[PDB]
Amino acid sequence: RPRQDPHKAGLSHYVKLFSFYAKMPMERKALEMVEKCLDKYFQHLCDDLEVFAAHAGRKTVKPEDLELLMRRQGLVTDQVSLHVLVERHLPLEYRQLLIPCAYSGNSVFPAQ
Amino acid sequence: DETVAEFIKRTILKIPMNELTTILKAWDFLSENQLQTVNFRQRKESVVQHLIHLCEEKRASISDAALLDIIYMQFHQHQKVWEVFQMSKGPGEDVDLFDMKQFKNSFKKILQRALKNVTVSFRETEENAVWIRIAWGTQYTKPNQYKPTYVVYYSQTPYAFTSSSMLRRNTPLLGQALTIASKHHQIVKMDLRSRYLDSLKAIVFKQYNQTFETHNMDSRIIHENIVEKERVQRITQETFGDYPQPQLEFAQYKLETKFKSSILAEREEPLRCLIKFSSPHLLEALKSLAPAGIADAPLSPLLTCIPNKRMNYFKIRD
Amino acid sequence: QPLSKSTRDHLQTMMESVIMTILSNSIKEKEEIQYHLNFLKKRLLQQCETLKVPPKKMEDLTNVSSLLNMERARDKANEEGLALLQEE
Amino acid sequence: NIVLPEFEKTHLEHQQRIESKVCKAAIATFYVNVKEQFIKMLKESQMLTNLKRKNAKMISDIE
Amino acid sequence: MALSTIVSQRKQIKRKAPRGFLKRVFKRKKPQLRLEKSGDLLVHLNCLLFVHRLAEESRTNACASKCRVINKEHVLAAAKVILKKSRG
Structure with missing residues (x-):
């Protein structure tokens, strides 16, 4: 008779992925405070997205706002673009929606 | 200090898991109510991590770390090989009135003046013994806590047992400290070494024999040589006694005798040899040689005279 | 024999430091003064590289002071220890 | 020690060739500074080695 | 294996992202905004690089x-x- 908090369902995905990268046995008490770290990151992440959108004069959040954030984070540099990072870390089905490629009569999707 | 924390962590890591609670209870530096907060069901590493935090929250010096080391040591006491000292006194000297505090002060002062930096600890043991732990240093070096020296001194008696780790450098100094603190004129080292401190103690105090006499089958097989078997059994019983033998593990003999057998008759110089005996329980393997047929009925006295002579290393000349 | 590479390393570094200090306090006449100072510096580097000295061993100039202080500390400790032993 | 006069003789040729009075003053200033550095480092290194051998001998003495 | 300590995951779960979870969490905190249809995926990418750094x-x-x-x-x-x- 299981009952699961929907909020904990989302965090459980990244918590398991954490144990894959660690490559060390990890104590149970370390698990839940990583969950504590994640929600703090999400809260502060959303706050930053407000200002960058607000500065541009549009309330809607567009991808180039996310590019601007990651450049300040140091993830995106002159050599490593946004397209390069998607290729390395995301599956094929997610790649089609994000990165545009021309095919079948020079048709490009998404339009860029 | 970080050094005392590392010292305590290493000492605790040495302790086996099942008996850690008894050691912690005997040490009793940490408050009793603090102990049940820690859980010993979990991993050893987690337990030591928690214990370091508890002992760091309270003030921990180096003296209590040394005390923990002494307490851990006297539980195992077979991790080191021990040696014996004997002290002698003048004929007209009167029997002294031993005082523990004066002994501690004198043994403190001799080391304190001869060297400069030195740590010595005491743990007054039941049954009339004293445990001492010494960390050696000099004027221009801090004491080395990795290589301590342990000595067990039995008060009112001429005997003291010491561990041979680093004592080679400062042997005369410790000899002087022991002979001054206890009011004895001379000291000599008995040539008897072992890893079983209790067997050494039983031999040295000669109390391994405690029996006092007081009044208060398939007849088809014929065994010839029966009289020889009964005679060798009687001789073995007479020579090796009937008490449980004290447990040793080693014995060494050095030989400088001439070869006497046509062969090397003209030679006039001794034949130089060195032989050693090793066994898990020596003096029990030796007892069984003659009945098994590997030795003659009486063994040579060099082998049957270990506990009576309180001797372990021998030298023989022609 | 020529002296070690460390001598030129240290002297070069201290000369950039002192040139920076003296240019810090000067207001006018920048280009000519810095060109003349750089020419003097490079010519002194050439002269000291060409120079010949009997062989010797030298420790780095930065750490001489602290090691010297610990040497005095050891001096005092060993002196007092020896005096006490002699008195006894 | 031996090469100390060599650096000193360099000061003579620099001063004669240069003419700007402020430049001459600057040359004098940092030349005095580097002379101070030379003397301090030489003396400190020399006394350091001397007291090092003294320490070795005197610890031998106490032993 | 004890309940208290979890061993490292030999096999990673499928790389599918929880798109529904990201939309609601972004919704509750800042209700007034609207996010573009593909913005959820990029947020997932940003979260991966954070967890990778943390590990x-x-x-x-x-x-x-x-x-x-x-x-x-x-x-x-x-x-x-x-x-x-x-944060940047």
């Missing part, structure tokens, strides 16, 4: 203290450095 820093702390099991004090120390670095 590396935690491992170094555990090895520095000579610990074979990642502990809570190791990862909290990791959180302070990464969280400040993650």
Whole structure:
């Protein structure tokens, strides 16, 4: 008779992925405070997205706002673009929606 | 200090898991109510991590770390090989009135003046013994806590047992400290070494024999040589006694005798040899040689005279 | 024999430091003064590289002071220890 | 020690060739500074080695 | 294996992202906004690189203290450095 908090369902995905990268046995008490770290990151992440959108004069959040954030984070540099990072870390089905490629009569999707 | 924390962590890591609670209870530096907060069901590493935090929250010096080391040591006491000292006194000297505090002060002062930096600890043991732990240093070096020296001194008696780790450098100094603190004129080292401190103690105090006499089958097989078997059994019983033998593990003999057998008759110089005996329980393997047929009925006295002579290393000349 | 590479390393570094200090306090006449100072510096580097000295061993100039202080500390400790032993 | 006069003789040729009075003053200033550095480092290194051998001998003495 | 300590995952779960979860969390905190249809995926990418950073820093702390099991004090120390670095 299981009952699961929907909020904990989302965090459980990244918590398991954490144990894959660690490559060390990890104590149970370390698990839940990583969950504590994640929600703090999400809260502060959303706050930053407000200002960058607000500065541009549009309330809607567009991808180039996310590019601007990651450049300040140091993830995106002159050599490593946004397209390069998607290729390395995301599956094929997610790649089609994000990165545009021309095919079948020079048709490009998404339009860029 | 970080050094005392590392010292305590290493000492605790040495302790086996099942008996850690008894050691912690005997040490009793940490408050009793603090102990049940820690859980010993979990991993050893987690337990030591928690214990370091508890002992760091309270003030921990180096003296209590040394005390923990002494307490851990006297539980195992077979991790080191021990040696014996004997002290002698003048004929007209009167029997002294031993005082523990004066002994501690004198043994403190001799080391304190001869060297400069030195740590010595005491743990007054039941049954009339004293445990001492010494960390050696000099004027221009801090004491080395990795290589301590342990000595067990039995008060009112001429005997003291010491561990041979680093004592080679400062042997005369410790000899002087022991002979001054206890009011004895001379000291000599008995040539008897072992890893079983209790067997050494039983031999040295000669109390391994405690029996006092007081009044208060398939007849088809014929065994010839029966009289020889009964005679060798009687001789073995007479020579090796009937008490449980004290447990040793080693014995060494050095030989400088001439070869006497046509062969090397003209030679006039001794034949130089060195032989050693090793066994898990020596003096029990030796007892069984003659009945098994590997030795003659009486063994040579060099082998049957270990506990009576309180001797372990021998030298023989022609 | 020529002296070690460390001598030129240290002297070069201290000369950039002192040139920076003296240019810090000067207001006018920048280009000519810095060109003349750089020419003097490079010519002194050439002269000291060409120079010949009997062989010797030298420790780095930065750490001489602290090691010297610990040497005095050891001096005092060993002196007092020896005096006490002699008195006894 | 031996090469100390060599650096000193360099000061003579620099001063004669240069003419700007402020430049001459600057040359004098940092030349005095580097002379101070030379003397301090030489003396400190020399006394350091001397007291090092003294320490070795005197610890031998106490032993 | 004890309940208290979890062994490293040999096999990673399918790389599918929880798109529905990201939309609601972004919705509740800042209701007034509307996010573009593909913006959810990029947020997922941003979260991966954060967790990747957190795992590396935690491992170094555990090895520095000579610990074979990642502990809570190791990862909290990791959180302070990464969280400040993650904000830009």
